[PDB]
Amino acid sequence: TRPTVRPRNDVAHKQLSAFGEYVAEILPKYVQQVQVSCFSELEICIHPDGVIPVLTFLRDHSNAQFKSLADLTAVDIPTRQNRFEIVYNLLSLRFNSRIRVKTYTDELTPVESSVSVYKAANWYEREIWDMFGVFFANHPDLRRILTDYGFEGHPFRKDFPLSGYVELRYDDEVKRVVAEPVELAQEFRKFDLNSPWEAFPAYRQPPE
Amino acid sequence: LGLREIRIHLCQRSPGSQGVRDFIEKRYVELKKANPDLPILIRECSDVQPKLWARYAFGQEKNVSLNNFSADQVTRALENVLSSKA
Amino acid sequence: GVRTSPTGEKVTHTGQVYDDEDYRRVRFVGRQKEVNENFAIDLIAEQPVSQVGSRVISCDGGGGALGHPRVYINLDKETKTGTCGYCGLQFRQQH
Amino acid sequence: TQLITVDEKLDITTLTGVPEEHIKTRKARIFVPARNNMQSGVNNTKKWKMEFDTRERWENPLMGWASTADPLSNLVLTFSTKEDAIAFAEKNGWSYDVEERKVPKPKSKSYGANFSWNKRTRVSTK
Amino acid sequence: ILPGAAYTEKSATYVNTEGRAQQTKVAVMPPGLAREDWKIIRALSEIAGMTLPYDTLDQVRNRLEEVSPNLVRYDDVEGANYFQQASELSKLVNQQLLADPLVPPQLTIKDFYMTDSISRASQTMAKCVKAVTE
Amino acid sequence: LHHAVIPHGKGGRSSVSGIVATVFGATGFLGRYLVNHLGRMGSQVIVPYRCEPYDTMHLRPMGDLGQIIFMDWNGRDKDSIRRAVEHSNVVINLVGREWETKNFDFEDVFVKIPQAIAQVSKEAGVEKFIHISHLNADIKSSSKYLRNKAVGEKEVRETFPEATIIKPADIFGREDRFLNYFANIRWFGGVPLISLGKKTVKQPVYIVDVTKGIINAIKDPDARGKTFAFVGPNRYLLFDLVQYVFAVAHRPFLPYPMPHFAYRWIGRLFEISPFEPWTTRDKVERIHTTDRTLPHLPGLEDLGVQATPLELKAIEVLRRHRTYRWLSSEIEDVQPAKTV
Amino acid sequence: TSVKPIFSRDMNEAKRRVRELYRAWYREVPNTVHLFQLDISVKQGRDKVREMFKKNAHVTDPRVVDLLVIKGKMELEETINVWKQRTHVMRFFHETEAPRPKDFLSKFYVGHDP
Ligand SMILES: NC(=O)C1=CN([C@@H]2O[C@H](COP(=O)(O)OP(=O)(O)OC[C@H]3O[C@@H](n4cnc5c(N)ncnc54)[C@H](OP(=O)(O)O)[C@@H]3O)[C@@H](O)[C@H]2O)C=CC1
Ligand SMILES: [Zn+2]
């Protein structure tokens, strides 16, 4: 398995497991899961009431010092009752390390804005309002950031279609760019590509 | 102007259809021999309440809920249907 | 071998030609209907049937890695020639 | 406290920005997708799917392409259970119909039954 | 001629030989100006001044439940009892048998490939008939 | 009915409306909005153009791909007309000039070319032909425009008997020569008017009303062989019509009587230009011709078009003529004109 | 059924926020007609605001109407500040669209949609 297989870094796996135990026992009020992936990435799955207590820990604790907010992301998974999964990616420049803090919400629960911890989130979770519909309480300037100004709907939700519900064109009657219902001259051809044969037995779920 | 069809809905297993079942086991054949050209459509189903539909002339339908009746009450309601023709 | 409909419109190698009562001929009014006059179905009939002395022949169309995948063609039927699925070059066992 | 008591029905139709034509006049179909009989594998029959009724696909005048006016046409959502898809349809106001999962029944196979003494299940060849 | 829809062209309740009611789904839409069948009948009733009490497909299925409530419970075979009363009613009129033998209209594979208007309009079924005759 | 021309879709830009239209004169004021309202339904619009193709540029975003077919045509050449109409199922005629040029007169534009288009459309099998006359068309009219347009209405009715001939009164829009014309006599002087402009009555009709009327006449089989009169809802005298024009634009309105024998000498003073003339004596005769009342002809209300009054669209037309000091005032910040 | 609010404890504070938002739109509409130089009357824009408010009038969930107040304040900030243009304000006035078929008979005539 030498040339074509990725080598495994067991030292970083062990170090992130020990730091995950560390974080899970310092903050057991909010930490729900801790898991270390096979390519040695750490995930601290918390409760959405612990955004500000955990992230101010990792921003300030002398064994963490995750001073950089790399990315802030929601993921729509509709089969869960809390369909949105807010993902905080953190970089500790002191310990040369990265951590992932994951939490959850539905459409109607506010997640507390992390602009008091990392100011970088001031646009990112703003984008999460724009793309997913997650409201962030106590955000300084929360509005849309990427969509058009009169845009109804939230694009990166999976119930929102690929082409939207409207399309623009210029109209010389009203001398104005107008929105009409979308009609494609060619429909986006949906390809069913999933093989009926299992590829990975290690990821096999138990049956009902 | 007149009765055109009767539709009797019931369940195979529910107790509210029970007396309705007692109407068909005992008192249906001589009903059919009373009106051999009147369609009396029996429709059994899974979890329906017993119901008596009377379609009249020009598409008018009357609607009698036969829930928890005895067989005598079903007989009286159906003879009211046969004798009304309104 | 391109042919022409009674409207004057040329017929493609598919068999596509607009009807006389079809309004969509108006896109070719004052302009041209671009057809390719080299029909592949006409130009594969010009090829000679390759007489060989083997029972199972192989075709990659020429070029090796410049043609198509190498398929193996059975030549047991003395009634029918053996046609390649890709290139359409047909073969025959000469006995 | 810092929690409120909402006994109301969960309905976010006014928030998702979908127009009314694609809220009230669509029929979501919730179903386990049937196994393609061209294949023997059953991994595509594991999860539930929500699809929609197929609206009008017509022909482009220019190229003959399949033009459409349905935005919800290519939208197939994947759910882990039936009740999750029921909750997701009832959350967005989509009227739906649910097909049950159709599992294959357990067979009683026997290789020796191919060569019985007195039963009709003898194979005529092998 | 009122141009209707096909079975791959409408959502449509069909009942098999065992009483199980099932529904098709709209695979494609009907060609040309042809519409779904009960849509045509309901539009005809709106023109004729005798307007039918439905507007959508689910309301047609509510009327369809009103006439017989098993046509809306899909992939369920509802048990039908009461063979005894139909047997007693069958003994009233002493209808006499004919002298002909029981012969079905389909004896060979030739008589299989064309039964309805769809198979009679086919060229694959026509090649099947031409194959099995020679 | 052919299978490629069956109406499909929901009537959007990329749909098939089943309408194949040859719109003669689509490079003008009515043809702009006509090709607009056709191409948004998903129609095959054939535009025969006489002008530079640059002057047809604004007709290109109005529909989907391949839905506007531009082709050359000459009114003194039946070959190009038959080249244009031979595939259409409706021909619309919008050929017009307010002035007679060096090579064309009012008879070439209104009698010769419309009879040629209607005759060629008859002998090519086109079912529907729409001709656009003027409401004040009359044989004994003082203006040569309205005389030749009445003669052309007669010839189109006799050589294509199933034609829909439409009478607009005086069409206003952004690119008109009616409210823009009334605006632009703050340049020349004090907007002169025959008999103070109070012996003539007008009922101007909005252009999208005329466009919806043309399209609803295309879609109506009962509009075959009719004669429609498209007028706006309110009748105005010319005086307070011009006063409302100058009140929307907030210009100094100071009218004065100019007599009839002297306001045609001003008409010949501006038609000696080789360009598009600023005015002519024919335009003098037609601004000072009252819009006649023809109640026997059907109108916009019989095609389902609700007529838009001037007090909704006059701000849209006449915001362009304002100076900056009163440029942003609103639609309601004006007293309406007096109707009759 | 024990959920977390956004702003409103119940429907009273929620209706208060809807009411204040309609007050702000009603005060804003004359400026929106003026400085976008829209060619509509002020009454017509106020009736469009009343239509956009009555469209959501069937909601009984405090969190959903909290989000509707939030999105209405966002559109109001996009209208007070000139971040919308004339096109974005006139997109509430569906003017280039045809009147869609409403009865069964015309929907039957034009197509297949229920
Ligand atoms: N208010 C009005 O203007 C009213 C007009 N009408 C009628 O409606 C029609 C259209 O009006 P409108 O758009 O305002 O006028 P325009 O002059 O602006 O438009 C005329 C159109 O026809 C073309 N055209 C003009 N003269 C000729 C010619 N000699 N040969 C070939 N093409 C020519 C023009 O294109 P090109 O660039 O080639 O010149 C243009 O596309 C006319 O028939 C007019 O009489 C009726 C009532 C009121
Ligand atoms: Zn080959």
Side-chain angles (χ1 to χ4, degrees):
Chain A
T1 64
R2 296 296 304 275
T4 58
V5 181
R6 181 178 175 89
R8 188 176 176 88
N9 192 1
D10 286 330
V11 177
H13 187 81
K14 184 176 176 67
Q15 286 172 354
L16 289 174
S17 294
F19 184 73
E21 296 171 358
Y22 182 76
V23 172
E25 69 193 357
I26 288 173
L27 298 165
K29 186 179 179 180
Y30 302 112
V31 169
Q32 293 176 355
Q33 288 188 0
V34 173
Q35 61 183 359
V36 185
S37 63
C38 65
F39 48 86
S40 296
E41 292 186 357
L42 179 58
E43 290 178 350
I44 307 298
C45 298
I46 64 166
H47 194 274
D49 290 332
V51 176
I52 303 299
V54 172
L55 294 177
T56 317
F57 181 74
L58 298 174
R59 198 266 308 277
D60 287 329
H61 186 73
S62 297
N63 293 117
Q65 306 186 11
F66 289 90
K67 297 291 190 289
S68 179
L69 177 64
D71 186 70
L72 172 55
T73 307
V75 177
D76 191 5
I77 300 167
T79 187
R80 302 173 186 175
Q81 64 182 359
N82 290 317
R83 67 181 293 177
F84 299 111
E85 189 176 8
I86 296 100
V87 174
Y88 294 89
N89 289 315
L90 299 174
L91 174 62
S92 178
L93 282 78
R94 179 64 61 198
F95 301 100
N96 200 3
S97 295
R98 294 184 186 274
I99 203 170
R100 188 175 301 121
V101 178
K102 301 170 77 174
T103 184
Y104 56 91
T105 191
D106 59 349
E107 300 89 354
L108 300 176
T109 303
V111 178
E112 183 68 28
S113 175
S114 66
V115 293
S116 67
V117 183
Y118 301 102
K119 299 287 184 290
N122 196 1
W123 283 8
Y124 282 112
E125 64 195 0
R126 180 174 167 179
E127 186 182 2
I128 299 176
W129 173 254
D130 197 2
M131 295 296 108
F132 292 93
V134 176
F135 178 71
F136 284 90
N138 302 118
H139 192 273
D141 193 2
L142 186 68
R143 61 181 180 87
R144 71 181 64 249
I145 196 166
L146 297 176
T147 56
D148 198 0
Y149 291 96
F151 188 79
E152 295 180 355
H154 298 284
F156 290 170
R157 286 181 179 179
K158 285 186 179 289
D159 60 354
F160 191 83
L162 182 64
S163 298
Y165 297 99
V166 297
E167 66 180 1
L168 299 187
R169 68 173 178 87
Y170 180 70
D171 186 68
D172 197 76
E173 173 191 1
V174 295
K175 297 295 190 292
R176 191 173 67 240
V177 172
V178 298
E180 289 182 352
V182 57
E183 294 188 358
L184 292 170
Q186 184 184 7
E187 184 181 358
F188 176 74
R189 289 171 287 166
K190 184 181 91 275
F191 288 165
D192 287 332
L193 296 171
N194 290 320
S195 179
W197 287 97
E198 186 182 3
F200 306 106
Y203 291 95
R204 185 179 295 117
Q205 299 179 0
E208 295 86 5
Chain B
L1 190 144
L3 185 63
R4 298 293 186 267
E5 66 187 3
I6 295 172
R7 295 193 301 268
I8 301 167
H9 307 299
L10 69 157
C11 170
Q12 299 94 15
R13 302 290 186 265
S14 294
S17 296
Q18 180 66 42
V20 177
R21 287 191 289 273
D22 290 331
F23 181 75
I24 306 171
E25 293 174 352
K26 284 91 171 66
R27 295 174 181 175
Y28 175 67
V29 174
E30 69 269 18
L31 182 64
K32 181 71 174 177
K33 292 187 287 185
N35 301 114
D37 53 354
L38 185 70
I40 304 168
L41 302 175
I42 287 94
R43 299 292 181 264
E44 290 179 351
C45 194
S46 178
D47 286 328
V48 297
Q49 296 183 358
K51 196 67 72 69
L52 185 63
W53 292 91
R55 182 172 65 85
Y56 290 98
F58 293 97
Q60 297 300 111
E61 292 181 355
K62 291 182 177 66
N63 194 4
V64 174
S65 180
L66 296 175
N67 197 2
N68 289 318
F69 287 174
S70 66
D72 291 330
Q73 297 179 357
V74 171
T75 303
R76 287 193 292 270
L78 202 149
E79 75 186 5
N80 289 318
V81 168
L82 291 174
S83 66
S84 64
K85 294 184 186 293
Chain C
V2 60
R3 68 177 177 88
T4 304
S5 64
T7 68
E9 182 179 359
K10 288 182 262 73
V11 178
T12 67
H13 64 277
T14 299
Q16 192 271 334
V17 61
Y18 289 108
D19 293 330
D20 184 75
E21 65 270 11
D22 198 357
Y23 67 98
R24 294 179 295 174
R25 293 191 289 116
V26 77
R27 70 184 67 189
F28 304 116
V29 165
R31 291 177 287 173
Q32 60 94 31
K33 178 180 179 181
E34 186 169 359
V35 294
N36 195 5
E37 292 182 353
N38 289 317
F39 288 178
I41 186 168
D42 289 330
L43 290 173
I44 202 63
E46 295 179 354
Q47 294 298 109
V49 178
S50 177
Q51 301 298 112
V52 300
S54 179
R55 183 176 172 180
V56 173
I57 206 66
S58 67
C59 185
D60 56 352
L66 291 173
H68 62 88
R70 189 173 68 245
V71 294
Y72 289 87
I73 298 165
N74 197 2
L75 299 175
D76 290 332
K77 294 183 186 291
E78 293 292 328
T79 303
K80 184 177 71 66
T81 62
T83 303
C84 180
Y86 293 91
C87 61
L89 292 175
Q90 55 188 358
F91 295 94
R92 190 186 296 115
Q93 189 176 2
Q94 65 186 358
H95 293 284
Chain D
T1 61
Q2 59 90 34
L3 291 174
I4 61 172
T5 303
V6 174
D7 289 330
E8 293 293 326
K9 191 257 179 65
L10 178 61
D11 190 74
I12 57 168
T13 64
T14 61
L15 294 175
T16 60
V18 182
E20 186 267 331
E21 182 67 28
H22 303 95
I23 293 171
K24 294 179 182 178
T25 63
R26 303 303 298 268
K27 180 64 70 177
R29 184 174 184 265
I30 294 168
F31 70 106
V32 178
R35 182 185 58 81
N36 191 3
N37 283 318
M38 287 287 110
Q39 280 162 336
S40 295
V42 299
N43 200 6
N44 289 322
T45 61
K46 297 292 184 182
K47 303 297 180 181
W48 292 85
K49 299 290 185 180
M50 182 185 290
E51 70 183 1
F52 294 94
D53 51 353
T54 68
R55 292 291 180 87
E56 183 180 1
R57 290 173 178 87
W58 63 93
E59 180 170 356
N60 193 5
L62 183 64
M63 294 300 290
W65 286 340
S67 299
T68 191
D70 192 5
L72 299 176
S73 65
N74 295 317
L75 184 60
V76 174
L77 292 171
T78 304
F79 295 99
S80 65
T81 59
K82 178 174 72 177
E83 296 88 6
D84 289 328
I86 290 171
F88 192 79
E90 291 177 353
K91 182 170 68 176
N92 286 315
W94 291 334
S95 179
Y96 59 93
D97 50 352
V98 177
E99 286 85 4
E100 292 293 326
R101 184 186 293 274
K102 295 181 184 294
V103 292
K105 64 183 180 179
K107 306 296 189 293
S108 180
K109 293 294 182 186
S110 178
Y111 183 76
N114 293 321
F115 305 105
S116 66
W117 167 247
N118 52 4
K119 301 295 186 289
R120 290 170 176 165
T121 180
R122 289 188 62 86
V123 293
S124 64
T125 185
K126 183 176 87 273
Chain E
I1 290 175
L2 271 53
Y7 69 103
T8 64
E9 295 177 354
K10 62 184 181 292
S11 180
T13 301
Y14 290 94
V15 186
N16 58 3
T17 185
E18 63 181 359
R20 176 173 286 162
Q22 286 176 348
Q23 56 181 355
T24 64
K25 298 295 181 179
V26 179
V28 299
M29 280 297 176
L33 293 171
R35 299 289 185 266
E36 189 173 2
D37 292 327
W38 62 270
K39 300 285 285 297
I40 303 164
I41 299 167
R42 172 60 171 82
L44 175 58
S45 68
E46 189 178 4
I47 296 297
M50 53 185 73
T51 308
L52 294 173
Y54 53 78
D55 290 330
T56 61
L57 179 63
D58 293 331
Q59 294 177 356
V60 184
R61 291 179 181 175
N62 287 121
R63 183 76 181 96
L64 197 68
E65 184 178 2
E66 287 181 350
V67 181
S68 61
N70 53 4
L71 301 187
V72 300
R73 293 177 181 173
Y74 298 99
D75 198 74
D76 285 328
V77 171
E78 297 296 326
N81 201 358
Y82 299 147
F83 290 90
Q84 183 63 43
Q85 287 84 25
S87 178
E88 292 178 355
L89 286 168
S90 67
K91 297 289 179 67
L92 293 174
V93 172
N94 290 319
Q95 182 61 255
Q96 294 294 319
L97 297 172
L98 294 175
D100 290 330
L102 282 171
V103 173
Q106 295 171 355
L107 297 176
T108 60
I109 192 67
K110 176 180 87 274
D111 296 327
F112 175 67
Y113 296 108
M114 286 182 178
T115 58
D116 55 353
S117 67
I118 299 174
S119 296
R120 287 192 294 271
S122 177
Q123 292 178 355
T124 301
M125 294 293 106
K127 288 190 286 290
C128 290
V129 174
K130 184 178 70 67
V132 299
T133 53
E134 59 92 22
Chain F
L1 190 67
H2 189 265
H3 61 88
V5 75
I6 296 170
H8 293 287
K10 292 177 73 69
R13 182 180 175 89
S14 298
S15 295
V16 180
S17 65
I19 299 168
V20 188
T22 300
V23 179
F24 286 96
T27 61
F29 171 63
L30 281 77
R32 181 184 294 272
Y33 292 162
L34 182 62
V35 173
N36 205 168
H37 283 274
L38 286 174
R40 69 178 68 186
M41 296 187 291
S43 296
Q44 181 64 257
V45 178
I46 290 94
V47 175
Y49 67 95
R50 191 267 305 272
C51 60
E52 184 68 29
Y54 182 79
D55 292 332
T56 66
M57 280 301 115
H58 64 278
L59 296 176
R60 292 184 183 270
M62 288 182 180
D64 202 75
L65 297 181
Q67 295 300 106
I68 297 98
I69 304 300
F70 295 95
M71 60 181 71
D72 293 328
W73 83 290
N74 192 2
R76 294 190 180 96
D77 192 1
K78 291 181 183 291
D79 195 0
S80 64
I81 302 170
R82 190 173 295 113
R83 190 172 65 90
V85 304
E86 62 181 0
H87 302 287
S88 299
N89 59 7
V90 59
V91 176
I92 301 100
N93 190 4
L94 294 167
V95 173
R97 290 286 92 187
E98 305 286 322
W99 58 92
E100 60 184 1
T101 64
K102 181 177 88 274
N103 302 115
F104 293 94
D105 54 353
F106 283 155
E107 187 176 1
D108 285 329
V109 177
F110 291 151
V111 179
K112 301 289 180 66
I113 292 169
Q115 188 269 333
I117 294 170
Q119 186 178 5
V120 169
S121 298
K122 174 63 74 180
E123 69 191 4
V126 175
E127 294 88 3
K128 296 179 182 180
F129 179 75
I130 290 175
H131 184 74
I132 304 297
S133 178
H134 191 275
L135 187 73
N136 296 317
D138 195 1
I139 302 298
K140 297 182 291 294
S141 178
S142 66
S143 67
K144 190 178 179 181
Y145 188 94
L146 296 173
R147 291 196 297 271
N148 290 116
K149 188 164 282 293
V151 173
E153 179 187 2
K154 182 178 182 292
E155 288 191 356
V156 167
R157 181 63 66 192
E158 72 188 3
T159 197
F160 197 91
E162 291 85 6
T164 298
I165 295 171
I166 291 172
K167 302 293 196 71
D170 274 325
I171 305 170
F172 63 95
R174 288 184 180 92
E175 295 89 5
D176 59 350
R177 289 182 298 273
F178 180 70
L179 299 183
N180 292 317
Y181 180 76
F182 289 157
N184 289 121
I185 326 110
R186 86 273 191 187
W187 291 349
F188 291 161
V191 58
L193 293 171
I194 300 298
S195 178
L196 278 305
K198 64 185 183 292
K199 298 285 102 177
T200 62
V201 183
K202 288 189 177 296
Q203 47 177 355
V205 62
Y206 182 60
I207 180 58
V208 179
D209 294 335
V210 179
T211 309
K212 290 181 182 292
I214 293 171
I215 283 179
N216 289 321
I218 293 168
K219 292 180 180 179
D220 195 0
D222 296 330
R224 294 175 65 89
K226 298 288 180 67
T227 304
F228 294 95
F230 289 178
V231 295
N234 291 315
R235 293 181 63 85
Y236 299 100
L237 287 171
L238 186 63
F239 178 77
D240 48 0
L241 182 63
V242 173
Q243 185 177 2
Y244 183 73
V245 171
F246 281 94
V248 172
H250 290 89
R251 295 289 184 181
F253 176 70
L254 57 156
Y256 64 99
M258 188 68 77
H260 190 276
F261 60 92
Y263 191 53
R264 295 179 67 188
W265 185 261
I266 301 170
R268 58 97 59 213
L269 185 61
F270 291 100
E271 66 181 358
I272 53 95
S273 176
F275 309 108
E276 297 185 352
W278 290 352
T279 186
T280 181
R281 66 171 70 89
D282 182 79
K283 188 67 175 294
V284 166
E285 292 292 329
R286 290 186 292 115
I287 294 296
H288 300 288
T289 299
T290 178
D291 283 336
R292 65 184 66 247
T293 299
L294 299 175
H296 59 89
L297 297 179
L300 290 170
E301 296 89 5
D302 287 327
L303 291 175
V305 179
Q306 297 298 317
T308 302
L310 183 66
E311 290 84 5
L312 298 177
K313 306 294 180 181
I315 178 63
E316 178 176 356
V317 174
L318 295 166
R319 192 181 292 276
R320 196 266 306 277
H321 301 283
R322 288 174 169 182
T323 58
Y324 174 71
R325 58 185 182 178
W326 284 283
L327 189 274
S328 179
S329 66
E330 292 87 5
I331 180 171
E332 71 269 13
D333 198 1
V334 66
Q335 186 179 4
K338 183 176 75 174
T339 62
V340 296
Chain G
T1 187
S2 297
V3 298
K4 186 173 76 174
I6 295 169
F7 287 105
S8 297
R9 302 291 296 167
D10 54 355
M11 290 300 293
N12 296 116
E13 296 176 352
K15 286 179 185 291
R16 179 179 293 116
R17 287 181 177 89
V18 175
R19 193 172 300 114
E20 292 289 328
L21 182 61
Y22 182 77
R23 290 172 70 91
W25 279 103
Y26 188 84
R27 297 295 184 185
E28 181 61 30
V29 168
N31 287 317
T32 302
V33 174
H34 179 70
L35 58 88
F36 287 98
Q37 59 185 359
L38 302 171
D39 293 333
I40 58 171
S41 66
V42 181
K43 181 257 288 183
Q44 189 175 2
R46 284 175 172 178
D47 289 334
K48 182 59 68 178
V49 173
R50 182 179 290 275
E51 182 177 0
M52 292 296 107
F53 270 88
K54 287 181 179 180
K55 182 171 71 177
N56 289 320
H58 65 280
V59 184
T60 61
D61 194 358
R63 295 179 292 171
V64 178
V65 300
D66 281 333
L67 284 174
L68 290 175
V69 168
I70 286 163
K71 295 176 73 174
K73 288 179 181 177
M74 288 180 181
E75 296 291 324
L76 182 68
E77 187 182 1
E78 292 175 355
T79 306
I80 294 169
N81 299 315
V82 184
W83 294 348
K84 290 183 183 293
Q85 278 77 27
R86 189 180 300 116
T87 175
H88 294 91
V89 180
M90 296 300 290
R91 283 169 193 174
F92 293 99
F93 297 91
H94 297 91
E95 289 177 349
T96 60
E97 295 175 354
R100 296 297 298 161
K102 296 298 293 295
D103 54 353
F104 185 82
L105 192 64
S106 58
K107 290 193 288 186
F108 179 77
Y109 288 161
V110 298
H112 301 287
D113 294 335

